[PDB]
């Protein structure tokens, strides 16, 4: 099935998911000189104080931390959004080398990794319905650069040994996602899609301007995960990013001048 290899990677996805060649695909390159400052955009409101994390799992494409989304406990509002979006999960994309790994780029610059916090619009009642709507999901994207360690990420890094291979999961309670946010919440926003199959065009992207720093030791631990299941030939989980797609008839807006 689909993946990130020579024979099943992003250049092949359109054969099973024709919307890969659609009009609002992600990720995109953010051209900072062509983005438009929009003073009508509100500040983001991130309310994560009551977040309840549940599990961490290797899904064969990335690793994911899942949250209890059965009530409004961890929500995103404001910015370009109408209504309330509940945090469902976060995951990362990363590279084999420090100079690649992010999905979005900024003036063609690639970061070492990209963190996606995935939220769904509560008016649609469940995430399955939300993915069928043009305003169903909001994904907060945060770039990672290599430098100083991020203390709030260490709890994640320390459990990765226990989910090395596809299909492994572990209890992961009491994790506070506020520890992954940068100082500033200034952002770019544009209408886009999931960056993995099914590539649904249901996402309002909110990409933060300020990267977080993580240490080389932290990102090295990501690169030791496996795409394969236990008992299969080892293939390291690296370069699980989709390249930038055509902007087409979209404008990227910025919350800041
Ligand atoms: C390996 C599958 N990853 C998909 C899963 N989901 C898709 C199915 C939900 O249907 C019920 S998801 O909405 O949690 C989401 S968000 C992104 S991204 N990279 O942020 O655009 C990928 C995904
Ligand atoms: Zn993602």
Curated annotation (Swiss-Prot):
Changing residue 4 to F: Enhanced activity. SMART domains: Carb_anhydrase (SM01057). Zn(2+) binds at residues 91, 93, 116. Changing residue 89 to P: In OPTB3; in Czechoslovakia. One of its GO terms (biological process) is positive regulation of dipeptide transmembrane transport. It holds the Pfam family Carb_anhydrase. Substrate binds at residues 195-196. The record marks 89 as: Involved in the binding of some activators, including histamine and L-histidine. Changing residue 103 to A/Q: Strongly reduced CO(2) hydrase activity. It is an enzyme of class 4 (lyase). Changing residue 59 to L: Reduced activity. It comes from the Eukaryota. Changing residue 61 to A: Reduced CO(2) hydrase activity, rescued by 4-methylimidazole (4-MI). Reduced proton transfer. Enhanced proton transfer. Enhanced proton transfer capacity. Target of drugs used in treatments against glaucoma disorder and breast cancer. It is linked to Osteopetrosis, autosomal recessive 3: A rare genetic disease characterized by abnormally dense bone, due to defective resorption of immature bone. Osteopetrosis occurs in two forms: a severe autosomal recessive form occurring in utero, infancy, or childhood, and a benign autosomal dominant form occurring in adolescence or adulthood. Recessive osteopetrosis commonly manifests in early infancy with macrocephaly, feeding difficulties, evolving blindness and deafness, bone marrow failure, severe anemia, and hepatosplenomegaly. Catalyzes the reversible hydration of carbon dioxide. Can also hydrate cyanamide to urea. Stimulates the chloride-bicarbonate exchange activity of SLC26A6. Essential for bone resorption and osteoclast differentiation. Involved in the regulation of fluid secretion into the anterior chamber of the eye. Contributes to intracellular pH regulation in the duodenal upper villous epithelium during proton-coupled peptide absorption. This is Carbonic anhydrase 2. It comes from Homo sapiens. The gene is CA2.
